[PDB]
Amino acid sequence: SLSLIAAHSHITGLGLDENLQPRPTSEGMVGQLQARRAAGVILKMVQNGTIAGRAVLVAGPPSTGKTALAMGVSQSLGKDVPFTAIAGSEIFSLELSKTEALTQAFRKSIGIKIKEETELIEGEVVEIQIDRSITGGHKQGKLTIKTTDMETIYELGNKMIDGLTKEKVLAGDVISIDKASGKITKLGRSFARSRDYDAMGADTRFVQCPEGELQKRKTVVHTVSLHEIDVINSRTQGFLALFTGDTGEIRSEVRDQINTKVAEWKEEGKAEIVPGVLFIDEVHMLDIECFSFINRALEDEFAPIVMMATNRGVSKTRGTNYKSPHGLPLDLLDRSIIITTKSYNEQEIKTILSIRAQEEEVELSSDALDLLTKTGVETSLRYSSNLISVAQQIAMKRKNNTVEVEDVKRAYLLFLDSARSVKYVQENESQYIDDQGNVQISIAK
Amino acid sequence: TRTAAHTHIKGLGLDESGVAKRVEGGFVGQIEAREACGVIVDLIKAKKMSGRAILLAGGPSTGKTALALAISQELGPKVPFCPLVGSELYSVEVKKTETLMENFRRAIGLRIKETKEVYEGEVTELTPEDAENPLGGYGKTISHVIVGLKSAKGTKTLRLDPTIYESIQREKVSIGDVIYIEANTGAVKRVGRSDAYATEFDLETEEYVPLPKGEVHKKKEIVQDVTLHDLDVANARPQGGQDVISMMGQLLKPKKTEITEKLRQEVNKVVAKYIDQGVAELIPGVLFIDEVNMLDIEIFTYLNKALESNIAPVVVLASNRGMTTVRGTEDVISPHGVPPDLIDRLLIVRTLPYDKDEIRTIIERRATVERLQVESSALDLLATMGTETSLRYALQLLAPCGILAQTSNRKEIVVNDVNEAKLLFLDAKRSTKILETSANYL
Amino acid sequence: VTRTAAHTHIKGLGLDESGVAKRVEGGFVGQIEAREACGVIVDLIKAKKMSGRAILLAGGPSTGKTALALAISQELGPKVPFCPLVGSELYSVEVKKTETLMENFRRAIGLRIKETKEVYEGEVTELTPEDAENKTISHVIVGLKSAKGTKTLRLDPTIYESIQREKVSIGDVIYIEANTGAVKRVGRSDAYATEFDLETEEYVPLPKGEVHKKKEIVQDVTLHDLDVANARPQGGQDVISMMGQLLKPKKTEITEKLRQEVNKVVAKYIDQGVAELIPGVLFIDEVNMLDIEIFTYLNKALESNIAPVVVLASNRGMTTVRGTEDVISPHGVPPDLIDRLLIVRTLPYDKDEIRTIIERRATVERLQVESSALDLLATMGTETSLRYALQLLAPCGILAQTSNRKEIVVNDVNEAKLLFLDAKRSTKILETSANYL
Amino acid sequence: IYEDLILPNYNNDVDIANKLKNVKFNIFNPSTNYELCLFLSKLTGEPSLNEFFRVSTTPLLKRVIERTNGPKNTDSLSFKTITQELLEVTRNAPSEGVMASLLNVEKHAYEREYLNCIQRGYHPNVSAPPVTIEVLGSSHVTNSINNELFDPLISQALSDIPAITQYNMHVKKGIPVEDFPKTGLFPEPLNKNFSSNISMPSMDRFITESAK
Ligand SMILES: Nc1ncnc2c1ncn2[C@@H]1O[C@H](COP(=O)(O)OP(=O)(O)O)[C@@H](O)[C@H]1O
Ligand SMILES: Nc1ncnc2c1ncn2[C@@H]1O[C@H](COP(=O)(O)OP(=O)(O)O)[C@@H](O)[C@H]1O
Ligand SMILES: Nc1ncnc2c1ncn2[C@@H]1O[C@H](COP(=O)(O)OP(=O)(O)O)[C@@H](O)[C@H]1O
């Protein structure tokens, strides 16, 4: 809940029926009926999970809702399924090769689900006793772990003992042990013994004393993506590269052995695979090497459903010198099924502005809504979307809670758009630095 | 389980010493190409000749990758197979020539047979037995160590050399543990505690292995299969030592490094020595490089002499482009994106495009593999759309038809469903036709 | 005296509380519309509700868009974070360039934490560790003496070991912090100076205050410090060391995972009420220097859940965007990005605005200029550039001080014109001569 | 500079910000972030859940030195790759072994090419210590750079304890053997001639350096 009101914060999910048909307006998304139906078909294909390596594409004019549909399918997919949304430019990295960066993004998007049963024994410790006879009985001890309510006494073992004395344990530390595996968690000093020492150690932490039963039992589910197994299996202390990014081109035999282990681990039923969606926004900035690797990276059973976006028409493919449709070569467009969005009329525009106005908590008069509708039709959707907040700021500077037509007029006057900036640049070209670098800095001549 | 635009290829479907059956192995058509791949597979399974190369020429969505997977499946899992795309080689960590050379050495497989004389079981009693005349000024004088091992239907007393005692004392080996030793080395490896002796029932850390099966004395014949790249990367990184440098190398990120010819030559020398001993067996495996039109000219220049080397295996090349310029040079227009010096070295297999009947048989084969039930009329409509647009556009459209059939609670694929799913998901041709008539550069 | 800079006469936007901008206030003159727009977006940043708002400033050179950005940063206050930037430093050799963009994004967003500092100080009167073996001491009792009295302290064995690592004995003066548990020795006491006539031990007097001092501080951080404090590859900034480390760490790519967990911990500490999130301003100047890849990663990263209010500034007209060969666009900004931007224009000035600018600059840089010299400076500014007259204002002061005259006269301006040339006259002399001027 | 930037002070904020950025907000803290620690405990099979906080807050050389020989949990996702199994299966292996002789070519190249009797060919021209830092009027700087130049764990790790001393703690002082400060981690040079850069004047070079 650290987030703020972003552009896509109104999109709660794909507003569909039970038979995959969109509503006129529900769950955030307005209009785009055919594209939303296609995305719902895609979502059901993801949720079935029996088909691997499908490549789908979202093509349309700018500001028509392709990434809106992407955030819709991300929110409708829900958690515990790996969703990855990368850009075109994130592939180009200096010390990590582009093709292997595609492999990282592909293996980050397919998960494997593991269930674990825990037997948590958490409570404040009181006493650890010495039952050994010159370490006879493998350094046996007695434990006096207590919660707030009940207290009990256990007997420990040699591994358990040097595990605790490897840690900084003494009376008062909130400690935790699994009954089955024996994993040790030293949370810190109990808060009741706060005033034992006036000065405390750096690593010392104050935790509340646990309340209730000691031997609580809970089952947790684990959803881990297939790239993390390669991360922890490539190095010795490999968990740092999960957070610092220094994976550094994991070799192919590690991926092969991990795929074999995942097949074995799913064959015995102790784990199952959860496929996800690799969303590649702005796919037109991949060169021919990335597309040649994408074409063969979708023929493995461990391949997510790749969804792409492109606002370019027939444009130049980067890395080559010939025109091509969608900014993509024809061999990639052979494999892809294309979902097409379309432009909006005035009604879709005014409903989208009404939703975005309620999302940013701005109350609107009807005349201001009609003026913003006309401006959204004329210039662009996103300019009229952006005008609402600055109109609200002008309103509170006028000591009015709501926005009238006057605030929208003033915000349209102060803040420009694309077309007016184009006109006002072409009017006064001499004052601006240009492609030839010549400018007249002086005012009067 | 999972459909991944493949897996109906169960093999070539070639008959023995003759023509291919038309619909065997999941393959439809391509009689000449499948005969050529059968000849190549026979030559590879002969394992006589090394440093050959085959290029597959044909248009998009023809089945060259399916031919390569057919080769790998007909070779068997004992034969290594390294599928590779042409863009894999450009690594910003090591030079491209070393990347291609290590992908060459990954394809060569080695199998070694041996025997393992081990004693395994659960220790019931270990005694650091003393000695007469115990030297002088010494805490102990161990003549020998007697250990009593217990296994399933087996129990032995082993009289060991004294040097196993410090390994026992280091590895915390006590009574109530399952251990696993080796005869000739005499180094103890503690598996853990026995399953029955979970005595500290309140809290425990060490996992309890079950009591081991079989006799206490086993002479197994473990056969392990490795690649030559495995041996090279094992010799290259420093094993043993544990003296700062190796430990820092283990903790830090591994770096791909230019493996010199001396290491590969020593590896080939010792491998040839144990081949001539008769205990090891060497088995070459194919290497598949797809989109070979996209390698730079210097990669082809290195491949000209890497192909001529002694130990490098066969390599299968795939290209779809025709009259084009080689990447990395200005105006060398050459067939398939391969420079003409390499073209004389390699053999070319041409794959032909299909027609309506092959398309519909491929579509129904993919539907049976996907476990989708589709009628004959929808099969004919999908065949006509596949001939009209492309094979892959029909093949990837089967699954949305299955979803749309599931939405209306129907098992059968019906013509209105394929028309509707066509309306949802456009073809690249019709999208391009939208693009030329688009107002906002769609 | 203080050093005058190019923007040290700017203090605020100078708009009134009603939103109207006064003509001469806050170190600004003219530029009414852009100042009003900047005041509105200042109120928008102070509202602290939306993420990813983007503003592009437009206008020619010497229009004061950098002055507007600094006026925004001064109107917000020192508490609100501000990350000024030029487009050319996004390109790096150590880490990839979109990663540098995301690093600056996380640099702009800031956090505010309250904290108490409790300090024990004085001479070690007694030191007696109680072992209570069951080697490993149970605890230690420590007496600290100052001029206002003494106290005694009870400590855990860890800080006792850290005390042992500062070579602390009886008579030393130490620094004890209650929360962090850091120890710093100061030296032996002044009362123990004459044990030997000359010894290496540094002798320091007793603290004349009390032993126990407490104060409350407000630790102001950004999210970048947070997600670099645990994105550490080699491990080990917790040691405080002078000499260089064995491995020099590089700037590394920061995964989405660690940013998500940092967001989780920051949100937990916010809901505990110890922290207060504050959005900031990321001001990237010279937007034309940005590559197309950074433009589209910016578009993509403008819609994230947490993102600052980015202000952009450029001077170019219909120019080709950097990195592509054919895409022409206003201000060097590609159309997909320029749809998201709200463009505010900055207009050039007439002669009276230039004269008032030069007068105010002469006041802040501590000179005194006669009125006719001001008229010549204004005519020179209209003829050539504002910046040429503004930079020539000070060598007039050097020449006036040279002749032991506090006032600037017209002859000083003429002499500085002979001494230093503008771009246009030097371009003319460049054109007239042949052999490389 | 030292007394206002590096050392803690009543008007300085070094220790407060250090703790606030390294303990209060470390994402491996089990007191605040349990599920992430349990996540990595499931992945790497670590017996203790504070180990990630220990690794994240330890210098690299120190973390290298205290290398733990304890095996992990057996339900982990740490699947030992075939190269590690190859290296561990030959860790103490005899000669005349098929997997033994494949995995040591450097010892074969050593013994075949007679590298045990080669001579030093290069010595550096100038050798220097690290550049001394001289702060006037403080003993804390002297203590700090003397500790950093001669850290007893790092110096003792690049060292060896004498044998009669190991007698003295192991028998006479009764110190357990595993509680010794670890030694012998300095890398072995290639030969006895490669140990030190000083070259003695050889009699045979006097014999052979003259024309007559
Ligand atoms: N179906 C929709 N419902 C509501 N808002 C939408 C819809 N489609 C687009 N938007 C608006 O468009 C903006 C983003 O559109 P986007 O998908 O980024 O355009 P493009 O597809 O050109 O990238 C968002 O601010 C969102 O409010
Ligand atoms: N002769 C064939 N028999 C059966 N399936 C085929 C045949 N040719 C192609 N296919 C199928 O068509 C799909 C696309 O072929 P593909 O391998 O992409 O062609 P190419 O090798 O030219 O890239 C593959 O899933 C493949 O299984
Ligand atoms: N309206 C104004 N009032 C006062 N000073 C101004 C005004 N506009 C510009 N300046 C001054 O002009 C100087 C240079 O302007 P600058 O921001 O460098 O121009 P640009 O916008 O091209 O970068 C600044 O130090 C600023 O103080």
- Tokens 């990837």 locate to B396
CB C212 within 8 A of CB C225: no
Say yes or no: CB of residue C67 within 6 Å of ligand 3. yes
Q: How far apart are CA A4 and CA C105, in angstroms?
A: 15
CB A305 within 8 A of CB B393: no
Residue A440 alpha carbon to ligand 3 centre in Å? 17
| DSSP H or E segment with residue B57 | strand B53-57
Q: How far apart are CA C331 and CA C55, in angstroms?
A: 13
Q: Helices B398-407 & A33-48, crossing angle to 10 degrees?
A: 100
Give one DSSP letter per residue of C79-106, joined into a string.
SS-EEEEEGGGG--SSS-HHHHHHHHHH
CB C35 within 8 A of CB C21: yes
CA quadruple B175, B177, B178, B183: dihedral positive or negative?
A: negative
Q: How far apart are CA B263 and CA B273, in angstroms?
A: 15
The candidate with the shortest Cα–Cα distance to B4, out of A383, D8, A296, is A296
Q: How far apart are CA C181 and CA C158, in angstroms?
A: 9
The candidate with the shortest Cα–Cα distance to B82, out of A48, A251, A77, is A251
Strands, E assignment, B168-216? 177-182, 189-194, 208-209
The candidate with the shortest Cα–Cα distance to C26, out of C39, C13, C17, is C13
Task: Look at residue D4 and give its three-state secondary structure.
Answer: helix
Residue C321 alpha carbon to ligand 1 centre in Å? 25
The candidate with the shortest Cα–Cα distance to B8, out of B398, B410, B415, is B398
- C238 and D57 within 8 Å at the Cβ level: the answer is yes
CB C111 within 8 A of CB C221: yes
Task: Look at residue D145 and give its three-state secondary structure.
Answer: helix
Which chain B residue has its CA at the smallest distance from A181's CA?
A: B205
Q: Whose CA is nearest to atom 18 of ligand 1?
A: A67
Torsion of CA C46, C48, C53, C54, to 10 degrees: 30
**Which atom of ligand 3 has the smallest separation from the CA of C63?**
21
Enter the DSSP assignment of A282: S
Give every CB contact of residue B416 below 8 A, 6+ residues apart in sequence. none
Give me the long-range contacts of A237-243 (CB less than 8 A, separation at least 24).
Answer: A237/B251, A237/D55, A237/D63, A238/D44, A239/D40, A239/D43, A239/D44, A239/D52, A239/D55, A240/C233, A240/C235, A240/D55, A240/D56, A241/B253, A242/C255, A242/C257, A242/D40, A243/C230, A243/C231, A243/C255, A243/C257, A243/C258, A243/C261, A243/D27
Q: How far apart are CA C140 and CA D54, in angstroms?
A: 25
CB B336 within 8 A of CB B74: no
Structure tokens at A383: 């300019």
- Solved using: cryo-EM
Structure tokens at D51: 């180990």
Q: How far apart are CA A70 and CA A372, in angstroms?
A: 26
Q: How far apart are CA A333 and CA C231, in angstroms?
A: 40
Say yes or no: CB of residue B28 within 6 Å of ligand 2. yes
Give one DSSP letter per residue of C179-236, joined into a string.
TT--EEEEEEESTTGGGSSS-SPPEEPPPSS-SEEEEEEEEEEEHHHHHHSS--SS--
CB C144 within 8 A of CB C90: no
Structure tokens at C300: 């993509």
The candidate with the shortest Cα–Cα distance to C55, out of C75, C26, C34, C71, is C34
Write the burial class of residue B155 (CB in 10 Å: 0-12 exposed, 13-18 middle, 19+ buried): middle
- What residue type is assigned to position C242 of the chain? M
The H helix count followed by the E strand count for chain D is 11, 0
Q: How far apart are CA A189 and CA A178, in angstroms?
A: 19
| Nearest-by-Cβ selection for A237 from D50, D55, D73 | D55
How far is C-alpha A291 from the chain's CA centre?
24
For chain A, the residues whose C-beta falls within 8 A of a C-beta of chain D are 114, 116, 163, 166-167, 176, 181-188, 202-203, 205, 207, 220, 222, 224, 228-229, 232-233, 237-240, 242-243, 253-254, 257-258, 261
Lining residues, ligand 1, CB within 6 Å:
A 7-8, 29-32, 62-68, 311, 352, 355-356, 381-382, 385
CA quadruple B407, B408, B410, B412: dihedral positive or negative?
A: negative
**Which atom of ligand 1 has the smallest separation from the CA of A66?**
21
Q: Which residues pair with C344 in a beta bridge?
A: C57
Q: How far apart are CA A334 and CA A327, in angstroms?
A: 14
Say yes or no: CB of residue B7 within 6 Å of ligand 2. no
Q: How far apart are CA A248 and CA A241, in angstroms?
A: 9
Q: Which residues pair with C227 in a beta bridge?
A: none
Structure tokens at D65: 């030195």
Characterize the bridge pairing of strands A206-207 and A184-190. Answer: parallel
Give one DSSP letter per residue of C22-78, joined into a string.
PSEETTEES-HHHHHHHHHHHHHHHH--BS--EEEEE--TTS-HHHHHHHHHHHH-S
Q: How far apart are CA B393 and CA B362, in angstroms?
A: 13
Give one DSSP letter per residue of A336-388, joined into a string.
-EEEE-----HHHHHHHHHHHHHHTT--B-HHHHHHHHHHHHHT-HHHHHHHH
Enter the DSSP assignment of B60: T
| DSSP H or E segment with residue A123 | strand A110-124
Residue B233's CB is within 10 A of a number of other CB atoms, namely 22
Torsion of CA B252, B256, B257, B260, to 10 degrees: 130
CA quadruple C331, C335, C337, C342: dihedral positive or negative?
A: positive
Give every CB contact of residue D74 below 8 A, 6+ residues apart in sequence. B207, D45
CB B324 within 8 A of CB B356: no
Q: How far apart are CA B340 and CA B399, in angstroms?
A: 43
Residue B105's CB is within 10 A of a number of other CB atoms, namely 24
What are phi and psi for residue A378, nearest 5 degrees? -70, -60
Characterize the bridge pairing of strands C183-189 and C203-204. Answer: parallel
Give me the long-range contacts of D144-149 (CB less than 8 A, separation at least 24).
Answer: D144/C241, D144/C242, D145/C242, D145/C243, D147/C165, D148/C241, D148/C242, D148/C243, D149/C243
Q: How far apart are CA C192 and CA C190, in angstroms?
A: 5
Ligand with smallest separation from the Cα of C58: 3
What is each CA distance from C84 to B30, B45, C69, C284, C313, in whole angstroms? 65, 67, 9, 6, 11
CB B282 within 8 A of CB A264: no
Q: How far apart are CA B168 and CA B190, in angstroms?
A: 9
Task: List CB contacts (< 8 A) between A176 and chain D.
Answer: 49
The H helix count followed by the E strand count for chain C is 13, 17
Resolution for this PDB entry, in angstroms? 3.5
| DSSP H or E segment with residue B54 | strand B53-57
Ligand with smallest separation from the Cα of A9: 1
Please calculate the CA angle C224-A88-A1 and round it to the nearest 5 degrees.
Answer: 40
Residues in chain C after which the chain is broken, C→N over 2.5 Å: 134
| DSSP H or E segment with residue C392 | helix C386-402
Residues in chain D after which the chain is broken, C→N over 2.5 Å: none
The candidate with the shortest Cα–Cα distance to B232, out of B316, B108, B81, B113, is B108
Residues in chain A after which the chain is broken, C→N over 2.5 Å: none
- What residue type is assigned to position A335 of the chain? R
The candidate with the shortest Cα–Cα distance to C54, out of C287, C294, C308, is C308
Residue C96's CB is within 10 A of a number of other CB atoms, namely 24
| Nearest-by-Cβ selection for A299 from B65, B202, B227 | B65
Structure tokens at B274: 């144990």
Structure tokens at A129: 């006793």
Say yes or no: CB of residue B66 within 6 Å of ligand 2. yes
CB B215 within 8 A of CB B153: yes
Please calculate the CA angle D104-D105-D111 and round it to the nearest 5 degrees.
Answer: 105
Torsion of CA C399, C403, C408, C413, to 10 degrees: -40
The candidate with the shortest Cα–Cα distance to C85, out of C71, C109, C99, C105, is C105
Residue B270 alpha carbon to ligand 3 centre in Å? 76
Buried b (16+ CB within 10 A) or exposed e, C101-133: bbbbbbbbbbbbbebebebbbbbbeebebeeee
Characterize the bridge pairing of strands B177-182 and C309-313. Answer: unpaired
- D48 and A233 within 8 Å at the Cβ level: the answer is no
Structure tokens at A444: 């009067």
CB A103 within 8 A of CB A298: no
Structure tokens at D172: 């006479």
Q: Which chains touch C (3 or more CB pairs under 8 A)?
A: A, D
End-to-end CA gap in chain D: 66
- A232 and D77 within 8 Å at the Cβ level: the answer is yes
Give one DSSP letter per residue of A169-203, joined into a string.
--TTEEEEEESSS--EEEEEEEGGGTTS-SB--SS
- Tokens 């039709």 locate to A377
- Tokens 């400033």 locate to C57
Would you put residue A315 in left (φ > 0), alpha (ψ -120 to 50) or beta?
beta
The candidate with the shortest Cα–Cα distance to A386, out of A396, A378, A375, is A375
Residue C35 alpha carbon to ligand 3 centre in Å? 12
Q: How far apart are CA C419 and CA A151, in angstroms?
A: 91
Buried b (16+ CB within 10 A) or exposed e, B338-364: bbeebeeebeebebeebeeebbbbbbb
Enter the DSSP assignment of D132: P
Q: How far apart are CA B84 and CA B107, in angstroms?
A: 11
Enter the DSSP assignment of D5: I
Give me the long-range contacts of B401-408 (CB less than 8 A, separation at least 24).
Answer: B401/B372, B401/B374, B402/B370, B402/B372, B403/A20, B403/A41, B403/A44, B403/A45, B403/A48, B404/A20, B404/A41, B406/A44, B407/A19, B407/A20, B407/A44, B408/A19
Q: How far apart are CA B2 and CA A48, in angstroms?
A: 10
What is each CA distance from A88 to A286, A287, B92, C98, C305, in whole angstroms? 6, 10, 18, 11, 20
The candidate with the shortest Cα–Cα distance to B259, out of A243, A251, A314, is A251
Enter the DSSP assignment of B144: E
CB C52 within 8 A of CB C282: no
Q: How far apart are CA A202 and CA C107, in angstroms?
A: 27
Structure tokens at B70: 């057919």
The candidate with the shortest Cα–Cα distance to C103, out of C112, C92, C114, C113, is C92
CB B65 within 8 A of CB B351: no
Q: How far apart are CA D161 and CA B14, in angstroms?
A: 72
Q: How far apart are CA D164 and CA D159, in angstroms?
A: 15
Task: List CB contacts (< 8 A) between D83 and chain B.
Answer: 230, 233-234
- Tokens 């808060």 locate to A191
Q: Which residues pair with B319 in a beta bridge?
A: B57
Give one DSSP letter per residue of A32-75, joined into a string.
-HHHHHHHHHHHHHHHH--B---EEEEE--SSSSHHHHHHHHHH
Give every CB contact of residue A438 below 8 A, 6+ residues apart in sequence. none
Check if B175 contacts A (Cβ < 8 Å).
no
What's the gap in Å between the CA of B34 and the closest CA on chain A? 21
**Which atom of ligand 3 has the smallest separation from the CA of C386?**
12
Residue B436's CB is within 10 A of a number of other CB atoms, namely 10
SS3 readout for D51-119: HHHHHHCCCHHHHHHCCCCCCCCCCCCCCCCHHHHHHHHCCCCCCCCHHHHHCCCHHHHHHHCCHHHCC
What is each CA distance from B192 to A179, B123, B128, in whole angstroms? 18, 11, 21
Give every CB contact of residue D134 below 8 A, 6+ residues apart in sequence. none
Task: List CB contacts (< 8 A) between B165 and chain D.
Answer: none
Q: Which residues pair with A28 in a beta bridge?
A: A13
The candidate with the shortest Cα–Cα distance to C157, out of D24, D15, A169, is A169
